[PDB]
PDB file of C-alpha atoms and ligand atoms in Angstrom:
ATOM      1  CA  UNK A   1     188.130 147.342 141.902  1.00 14.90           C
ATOM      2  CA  UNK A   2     187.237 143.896 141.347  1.00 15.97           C
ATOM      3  CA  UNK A   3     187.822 141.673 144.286  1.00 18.20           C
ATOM      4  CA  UNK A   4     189.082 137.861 143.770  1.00 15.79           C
ATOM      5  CA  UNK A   5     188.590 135.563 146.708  1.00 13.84           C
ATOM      6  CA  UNK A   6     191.904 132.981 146.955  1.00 16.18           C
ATOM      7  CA  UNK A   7     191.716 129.944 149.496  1.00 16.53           C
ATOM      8  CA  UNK A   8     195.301 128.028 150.219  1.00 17.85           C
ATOM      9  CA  UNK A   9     194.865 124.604 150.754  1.00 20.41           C
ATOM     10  CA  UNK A  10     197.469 121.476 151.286  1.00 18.30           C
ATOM     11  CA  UNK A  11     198.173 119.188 154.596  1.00 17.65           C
ATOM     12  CA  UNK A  12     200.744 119.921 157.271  1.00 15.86           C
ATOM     13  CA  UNK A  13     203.477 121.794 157.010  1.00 16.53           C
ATOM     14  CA  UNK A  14     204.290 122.368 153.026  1.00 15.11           C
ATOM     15  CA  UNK A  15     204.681 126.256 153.202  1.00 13.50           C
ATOM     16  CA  UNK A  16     200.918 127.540 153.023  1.00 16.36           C
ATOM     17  CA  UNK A  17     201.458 130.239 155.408  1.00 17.36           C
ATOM     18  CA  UNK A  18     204.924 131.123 154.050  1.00 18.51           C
ATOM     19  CA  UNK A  19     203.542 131.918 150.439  1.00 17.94           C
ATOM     20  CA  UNK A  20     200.813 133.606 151.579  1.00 17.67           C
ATOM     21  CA  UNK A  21     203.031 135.615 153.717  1.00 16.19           C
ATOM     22  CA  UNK A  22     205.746 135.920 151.112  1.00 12.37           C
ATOM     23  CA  UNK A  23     203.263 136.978 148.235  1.00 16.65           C
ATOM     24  CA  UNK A  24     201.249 139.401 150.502  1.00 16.93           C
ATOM     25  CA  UNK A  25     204.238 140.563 152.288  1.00 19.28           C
ATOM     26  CA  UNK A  26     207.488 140.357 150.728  1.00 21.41           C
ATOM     27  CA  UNK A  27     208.849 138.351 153.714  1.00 18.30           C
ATOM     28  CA  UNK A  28     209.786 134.812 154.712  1.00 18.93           C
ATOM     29  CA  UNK A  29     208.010 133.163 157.714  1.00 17.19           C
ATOM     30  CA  UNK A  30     211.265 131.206 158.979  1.00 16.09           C
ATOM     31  CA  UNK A  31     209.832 129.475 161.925  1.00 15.70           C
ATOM     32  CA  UNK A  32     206.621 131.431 162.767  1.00 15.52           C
ATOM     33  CA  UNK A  33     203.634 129.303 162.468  1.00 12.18           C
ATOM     34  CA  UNK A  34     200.807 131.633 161.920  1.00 15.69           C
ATOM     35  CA  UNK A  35     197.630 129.908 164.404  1.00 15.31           C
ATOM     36  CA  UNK A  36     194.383 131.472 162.480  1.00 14.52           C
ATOM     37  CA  UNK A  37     193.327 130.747 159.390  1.00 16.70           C
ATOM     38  CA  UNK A  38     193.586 134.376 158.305  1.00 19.39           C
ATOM     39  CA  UNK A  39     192.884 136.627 155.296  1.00 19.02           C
ATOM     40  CA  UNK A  40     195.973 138.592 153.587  1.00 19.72           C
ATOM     41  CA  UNK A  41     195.146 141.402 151.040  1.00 19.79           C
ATOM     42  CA  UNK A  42     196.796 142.695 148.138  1.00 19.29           C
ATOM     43  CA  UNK A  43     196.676 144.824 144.775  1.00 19.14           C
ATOM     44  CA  UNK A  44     197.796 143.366 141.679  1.00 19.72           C
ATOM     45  CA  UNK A  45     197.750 144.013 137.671  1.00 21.40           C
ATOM     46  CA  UNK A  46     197.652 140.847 135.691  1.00 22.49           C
ATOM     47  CA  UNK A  47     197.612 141.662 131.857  1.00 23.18           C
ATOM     48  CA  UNK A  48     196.692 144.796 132.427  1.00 23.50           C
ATOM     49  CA  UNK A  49     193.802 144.662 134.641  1.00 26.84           C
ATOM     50  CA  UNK A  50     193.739 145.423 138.509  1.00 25.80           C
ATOM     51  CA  UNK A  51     192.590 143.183 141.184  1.00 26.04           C
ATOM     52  CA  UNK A  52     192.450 143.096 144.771  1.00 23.78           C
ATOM     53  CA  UNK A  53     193.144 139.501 146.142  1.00 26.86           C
ATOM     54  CA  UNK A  54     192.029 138.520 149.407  1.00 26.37           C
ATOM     55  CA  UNK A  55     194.060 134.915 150.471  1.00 28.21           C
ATOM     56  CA  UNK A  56     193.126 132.895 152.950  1.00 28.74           C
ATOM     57  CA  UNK A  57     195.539 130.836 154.794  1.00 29.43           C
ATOM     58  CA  UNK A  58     193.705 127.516 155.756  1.00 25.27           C
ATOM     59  CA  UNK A  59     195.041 125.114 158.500  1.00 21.51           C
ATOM     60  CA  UNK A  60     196.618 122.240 157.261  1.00 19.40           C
ATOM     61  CA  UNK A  61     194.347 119.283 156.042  1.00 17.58           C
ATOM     62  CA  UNK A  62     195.576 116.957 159.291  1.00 13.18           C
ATOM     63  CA  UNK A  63     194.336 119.773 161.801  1.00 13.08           C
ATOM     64  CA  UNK A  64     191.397 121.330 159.523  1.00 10.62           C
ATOM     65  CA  UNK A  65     188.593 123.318 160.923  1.00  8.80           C
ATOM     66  CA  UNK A  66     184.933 123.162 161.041  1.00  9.08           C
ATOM     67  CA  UNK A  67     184.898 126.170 158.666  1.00  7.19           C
ATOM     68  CA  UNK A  68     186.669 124.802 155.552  1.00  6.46           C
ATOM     69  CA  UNK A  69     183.340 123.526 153.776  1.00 11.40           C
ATOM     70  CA  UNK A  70     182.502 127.220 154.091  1.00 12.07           C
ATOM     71  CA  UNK A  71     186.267 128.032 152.749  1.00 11.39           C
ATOM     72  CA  UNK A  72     185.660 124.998 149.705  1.00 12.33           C
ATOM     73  CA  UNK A  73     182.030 126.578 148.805  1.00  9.28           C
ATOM     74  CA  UNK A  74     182.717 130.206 148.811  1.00  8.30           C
ATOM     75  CA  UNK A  75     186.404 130.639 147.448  1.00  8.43           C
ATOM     76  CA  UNK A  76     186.688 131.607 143.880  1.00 10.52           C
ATOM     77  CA  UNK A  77     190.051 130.181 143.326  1.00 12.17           C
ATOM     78  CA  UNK A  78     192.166 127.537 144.660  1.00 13.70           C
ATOM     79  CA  UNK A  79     196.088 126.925 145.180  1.00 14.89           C
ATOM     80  CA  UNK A  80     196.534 123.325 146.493  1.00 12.92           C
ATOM     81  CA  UNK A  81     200.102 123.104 147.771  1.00 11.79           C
ATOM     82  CA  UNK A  82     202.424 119.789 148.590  1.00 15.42           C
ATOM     83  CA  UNK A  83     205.814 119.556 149.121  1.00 15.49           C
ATOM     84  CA  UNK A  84     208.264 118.242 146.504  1.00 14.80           C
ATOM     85  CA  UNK A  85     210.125 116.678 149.509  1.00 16.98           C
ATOM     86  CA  UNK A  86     206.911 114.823 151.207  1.00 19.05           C
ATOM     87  CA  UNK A  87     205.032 112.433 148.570  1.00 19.08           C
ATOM     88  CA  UNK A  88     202.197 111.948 150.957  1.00 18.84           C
ATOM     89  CA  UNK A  89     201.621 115.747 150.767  1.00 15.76           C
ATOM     90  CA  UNK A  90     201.529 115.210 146.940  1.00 15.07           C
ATOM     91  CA  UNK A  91     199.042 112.237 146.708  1.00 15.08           C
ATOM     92  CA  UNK A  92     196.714 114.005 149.471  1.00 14.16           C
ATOM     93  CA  UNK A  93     195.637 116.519 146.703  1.00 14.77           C
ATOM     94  CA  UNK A  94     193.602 114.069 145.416  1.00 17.54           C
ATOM     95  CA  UNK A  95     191.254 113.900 147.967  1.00 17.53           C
ATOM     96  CA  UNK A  96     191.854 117.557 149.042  1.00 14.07           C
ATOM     97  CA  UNK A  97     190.495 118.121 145.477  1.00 17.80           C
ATOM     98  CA  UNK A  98     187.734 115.995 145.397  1.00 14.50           C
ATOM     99  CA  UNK A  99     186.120 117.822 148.161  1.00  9.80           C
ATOM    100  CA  UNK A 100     186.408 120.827 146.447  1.00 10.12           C
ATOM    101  CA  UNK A 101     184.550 119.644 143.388  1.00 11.43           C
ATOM    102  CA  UNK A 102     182.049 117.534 145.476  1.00  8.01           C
ATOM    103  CA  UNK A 103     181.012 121.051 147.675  1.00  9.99           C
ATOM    104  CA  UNK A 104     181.102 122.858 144.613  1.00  9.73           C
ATOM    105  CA  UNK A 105     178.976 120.248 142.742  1.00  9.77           C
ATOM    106  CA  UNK A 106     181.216 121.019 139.676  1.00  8.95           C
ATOM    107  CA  UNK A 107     184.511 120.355 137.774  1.00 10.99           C
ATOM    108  CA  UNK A 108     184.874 124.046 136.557  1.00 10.73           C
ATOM    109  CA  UNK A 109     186.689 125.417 139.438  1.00 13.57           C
ATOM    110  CA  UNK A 110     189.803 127.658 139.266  1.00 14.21           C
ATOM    111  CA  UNK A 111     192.693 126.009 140.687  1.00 14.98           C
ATOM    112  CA  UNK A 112     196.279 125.830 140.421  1.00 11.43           C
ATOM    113  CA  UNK A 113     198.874 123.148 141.871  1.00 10.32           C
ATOM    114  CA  UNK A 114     201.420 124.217 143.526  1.00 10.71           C
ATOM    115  CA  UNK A 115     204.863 121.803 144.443  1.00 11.18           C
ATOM    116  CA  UNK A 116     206.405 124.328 147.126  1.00 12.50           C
ATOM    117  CA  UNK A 117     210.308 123.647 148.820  1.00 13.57           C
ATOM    118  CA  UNK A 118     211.934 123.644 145.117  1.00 15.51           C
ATOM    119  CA  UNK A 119     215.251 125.114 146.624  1.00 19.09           C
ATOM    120  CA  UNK A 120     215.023 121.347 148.324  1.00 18.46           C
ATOM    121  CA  UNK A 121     216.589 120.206 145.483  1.00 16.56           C
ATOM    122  CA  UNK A 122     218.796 117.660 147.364  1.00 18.80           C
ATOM    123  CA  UNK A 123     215.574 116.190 149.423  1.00 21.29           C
ATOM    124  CA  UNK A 124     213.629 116.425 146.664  1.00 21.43           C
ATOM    125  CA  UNK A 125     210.920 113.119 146.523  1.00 20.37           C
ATOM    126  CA  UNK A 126     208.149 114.134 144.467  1.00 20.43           C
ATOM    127  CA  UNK A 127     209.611 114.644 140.832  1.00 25.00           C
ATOM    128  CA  UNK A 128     208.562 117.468 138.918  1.00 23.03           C
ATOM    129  CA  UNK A 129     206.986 115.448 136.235  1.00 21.07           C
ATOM    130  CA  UNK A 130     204.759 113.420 138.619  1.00 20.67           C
ATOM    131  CA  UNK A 131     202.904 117.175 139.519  1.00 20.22           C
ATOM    132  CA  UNK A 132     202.916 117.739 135.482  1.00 19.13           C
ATOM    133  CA  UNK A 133     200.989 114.342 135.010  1.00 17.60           C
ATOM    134  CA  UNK A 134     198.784 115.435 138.340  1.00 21.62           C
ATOM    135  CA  UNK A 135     197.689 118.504 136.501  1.00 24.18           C
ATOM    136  CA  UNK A 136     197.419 116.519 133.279  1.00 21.62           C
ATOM    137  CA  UNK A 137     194.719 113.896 135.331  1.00 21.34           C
ATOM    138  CA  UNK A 138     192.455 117.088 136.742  1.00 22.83           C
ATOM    139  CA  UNK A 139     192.332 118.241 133.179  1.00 21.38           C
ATOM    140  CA  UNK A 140     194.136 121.622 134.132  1.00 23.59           C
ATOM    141  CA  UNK A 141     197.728 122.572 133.044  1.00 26.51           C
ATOM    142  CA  UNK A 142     197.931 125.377 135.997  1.00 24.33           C
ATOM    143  CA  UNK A 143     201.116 124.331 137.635  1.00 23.58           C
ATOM    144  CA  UNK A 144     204.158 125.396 139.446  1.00 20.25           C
ATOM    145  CA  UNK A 145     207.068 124.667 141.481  1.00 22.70           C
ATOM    146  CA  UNK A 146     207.616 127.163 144.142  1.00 22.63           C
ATOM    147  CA  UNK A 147     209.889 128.501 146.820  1.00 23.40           C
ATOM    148  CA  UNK A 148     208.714 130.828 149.865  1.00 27.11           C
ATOM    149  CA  UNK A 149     211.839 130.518 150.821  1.00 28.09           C
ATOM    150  CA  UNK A 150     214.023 131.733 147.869  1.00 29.16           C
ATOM    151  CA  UNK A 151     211.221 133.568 146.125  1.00 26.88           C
ATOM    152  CA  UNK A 152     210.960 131.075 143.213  1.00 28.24           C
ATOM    153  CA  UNK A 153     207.325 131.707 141.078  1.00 28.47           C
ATOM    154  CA  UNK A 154     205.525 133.278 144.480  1.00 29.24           C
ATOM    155  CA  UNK A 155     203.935 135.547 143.034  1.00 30.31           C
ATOM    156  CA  UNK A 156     203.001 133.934 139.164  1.00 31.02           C
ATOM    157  CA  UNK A 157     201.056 131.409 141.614  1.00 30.44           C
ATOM    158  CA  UNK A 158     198.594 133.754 142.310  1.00 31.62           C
ATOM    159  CA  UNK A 159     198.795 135.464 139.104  1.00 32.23           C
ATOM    160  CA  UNK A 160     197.841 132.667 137.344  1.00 33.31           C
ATOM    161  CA  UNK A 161     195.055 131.722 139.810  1.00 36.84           C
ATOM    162  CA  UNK A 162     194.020 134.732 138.964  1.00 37.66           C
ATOM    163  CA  UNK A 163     194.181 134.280 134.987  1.00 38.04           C
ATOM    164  CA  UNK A 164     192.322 131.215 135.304  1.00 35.72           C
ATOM    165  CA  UNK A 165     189.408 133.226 137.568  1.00 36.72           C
ATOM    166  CA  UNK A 166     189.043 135.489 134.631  1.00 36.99           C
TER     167      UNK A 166
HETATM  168  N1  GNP B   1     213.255 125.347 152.497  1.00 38.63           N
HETATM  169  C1  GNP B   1     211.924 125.830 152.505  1.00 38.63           C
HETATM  170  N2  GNP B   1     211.238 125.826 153.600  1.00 38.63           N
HETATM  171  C2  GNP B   1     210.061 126.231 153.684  1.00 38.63           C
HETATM  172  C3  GNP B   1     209.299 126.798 152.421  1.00 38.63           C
HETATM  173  N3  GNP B   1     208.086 127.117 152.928  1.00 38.63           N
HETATM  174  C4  GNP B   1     207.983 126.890 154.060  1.00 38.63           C
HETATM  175  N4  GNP B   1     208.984 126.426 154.567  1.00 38.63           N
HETATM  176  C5  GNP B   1     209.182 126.022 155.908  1.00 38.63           C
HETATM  177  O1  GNP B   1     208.323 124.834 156.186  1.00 38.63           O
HETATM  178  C6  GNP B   1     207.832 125.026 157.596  1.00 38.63           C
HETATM  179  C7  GNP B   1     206.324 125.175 157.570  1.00 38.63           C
HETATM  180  O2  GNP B   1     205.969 126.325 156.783  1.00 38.63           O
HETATM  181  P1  GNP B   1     204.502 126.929 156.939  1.00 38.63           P
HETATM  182  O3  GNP B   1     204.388 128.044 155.935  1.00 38.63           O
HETATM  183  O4  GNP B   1     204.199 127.283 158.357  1.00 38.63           O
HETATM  184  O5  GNP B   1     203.592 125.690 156.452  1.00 38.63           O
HETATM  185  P2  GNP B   1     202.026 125.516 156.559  1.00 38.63           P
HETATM  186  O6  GNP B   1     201.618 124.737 155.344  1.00 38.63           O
HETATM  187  O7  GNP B   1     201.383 126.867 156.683  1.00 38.63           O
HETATM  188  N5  GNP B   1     201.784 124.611 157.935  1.00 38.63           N
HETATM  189  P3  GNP B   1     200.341 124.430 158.701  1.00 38.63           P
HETATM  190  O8  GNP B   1     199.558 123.456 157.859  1.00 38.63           O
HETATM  191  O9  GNP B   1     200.589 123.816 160.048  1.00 38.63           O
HETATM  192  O10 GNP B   1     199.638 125.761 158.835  1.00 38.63           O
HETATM  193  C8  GNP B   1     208.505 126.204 158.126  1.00 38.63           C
HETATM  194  O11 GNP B   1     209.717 125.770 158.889  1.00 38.63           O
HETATM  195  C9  GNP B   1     208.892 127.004 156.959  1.00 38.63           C
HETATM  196  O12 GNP B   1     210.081 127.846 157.205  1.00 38.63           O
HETATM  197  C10 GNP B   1     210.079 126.791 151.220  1.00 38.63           C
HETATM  198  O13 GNP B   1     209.689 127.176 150.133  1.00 38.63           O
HETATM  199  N6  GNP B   1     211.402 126.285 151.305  1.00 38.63           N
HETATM  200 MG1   MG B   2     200.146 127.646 158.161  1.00 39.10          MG
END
């Protein structure tokens, strides 16, 4: 089966580990802050063709490790996750992204944004036209708001990583 090699990036704290976990899983994190930057498998169909996904769970950007170069070169597709209640989370995937393209030495990467805590409604900073307009700059329309929490698009993010990896 073909294999497709995912890489979740983002700074502190906006729910990297909880999607993975969700997705992968089928479960919420709550508190538990996973400590290794660890791999999570599973088997999808997206229009009509299996795949195995392997996701890795990066640390966030603040507290990143010497092995994300590696993670930036090697991945085949990218989710790059902020929180819709932290702006600075939001304007840090410019740079986040920017690395990506400048270890890839290339613009044509597959990569999907992804404005996670949308049941936040009420503390809710980073509107949802600011992450259209994002996506619009990077010349790719691959975006989503997301919940972990309430299971709100988890698993069409990495579906349509996967559609754009195709
Ligand atoms: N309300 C809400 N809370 C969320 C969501 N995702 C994550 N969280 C919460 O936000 C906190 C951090 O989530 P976590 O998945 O560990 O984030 P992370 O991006 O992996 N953090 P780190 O960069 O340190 O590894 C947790 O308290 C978690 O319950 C979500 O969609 N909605
Ligand atoms: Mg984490």
């Amino acid at each position: 089966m073909r294999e497709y090699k995912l890489v979740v990036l983002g700074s502190g704290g906006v729910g990297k580990s909880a999607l993975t976990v969700q997705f992968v899983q089928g479960i919420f994190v709550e508190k538990y802050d996973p400590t290794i930057e660890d791999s999570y498998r599973k088997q999808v169909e997206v229009d009509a063709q299996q795949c195995m996904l392997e996701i890795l769970d990066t640390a966030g950007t603040e507290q990143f490790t010497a092995m994300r170069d590696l993670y930036m070169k090697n991945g085949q597709g990218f989710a790059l996750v902020y929180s819709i209640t932290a702006q600075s989370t939001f304007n840090d995937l410019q740079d986040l992204r920017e690395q990506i393209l400048r270890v890839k030495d290339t613009d044509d990467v597959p990569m999907i944004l992804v404005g996670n805590k949308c049941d936040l409604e009420d503390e809710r900073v980073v509107g949802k036209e600011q992450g259209q307009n994002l996506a619009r700059q990077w010349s790719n329309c691959a975006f989503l708001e997301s919940s972990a929490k309430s299971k709100i698009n988890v698993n069409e993010i990495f579906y349509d990583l996967v559609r754009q990896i195709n």
